[PDB]
Design a protein around this ligand. Sequence first.
Ligand SMILES: Nc1nc(=O)c2cc(CCCc3ccc(C(=O)N[C@@H](CCC(=O)O)C(=O)O)s3)[nH]c2[nH]1
Ligand SMILES: NCC(=O)N[C@@H]1O[C@H](COP(=O)([O-])[O-])[C@@H](O)[C@H]1O
Length: 200
Amino acid sequence: ARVAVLISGTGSNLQALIDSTREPNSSAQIDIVISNKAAVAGLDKAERAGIPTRVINHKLYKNRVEFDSAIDLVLEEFSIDIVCLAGFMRILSGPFVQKWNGKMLNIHPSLLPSFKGSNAHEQALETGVTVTGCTVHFVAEDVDAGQIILQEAVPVKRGDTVATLSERVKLAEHKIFPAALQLVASGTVQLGENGKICWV
Ligand SMILES: Nc1nc(=O)c2cc(CCCc3ccc(C(=O)N[C@@H](CCC(=O)O)C(=O)O)s3)[nH]c2[nH]1
Ligand SMILES: NCC(=O)N[C@@H]1O[C@H](COP(=O)([O-])[O-])[C@@H](O)[C@H]1O
């Protein structure tokens, strides 16, 4: 399966995916990395790994649909089968999500359905949970509501901040995102006809 990874920043999840997809038994290959922000560290990681990169600045498009179409164009150029959102911080449009239905994955740093949105760690700390975690899910139109593929729980320590908690949760992200990608790319897991998760 041919994979596009979309990023907006550091790219530690991208790096974990690059490392996993180069194992001999990987069913996935990363053929393109797309960023919506220029000069981010994830681009360096991709170029260092010999993967093509494209920057699509959302600020240069009139609306969300035009932006997504620019993304889609590149996806078609590279004959992509699967899309991974890896620190990609934009909300995708309905038709774009519909086209890639069952083919697009997102990592989210909470145990969904808790703490949806862009500041999951702040929410978790504010709420005072002692267990948080991360979630890989299929991307549906409603944000952070698509079908869950894998999750891993991560403890919150007394005195945690966003810095220390996100560091601990990233260690789990780097385990389940590659595992989830391998499940979908091998055809082991798919979005079922009834929309629910199917383990073949
Ligand atoms: N249709 C859709 N379903 C999803 O399940 C999903 C996950 C993402 C991946 C990210 C989900 C995000 C949640 C909140 C964000 C935010 O508040 N701010 C962005 C600005 C860009 C934007 O919201 O369009 C920021 O960091 O500046 S970004 N994008 C998705 N789009
Ligand atoms: N709404 C999605 C979201 O919050 N994504 C989160 O952004 C970070 C990106 O780090 P990275 O650039 O090192 O992968 C990760 O913690 C990821 O779960």
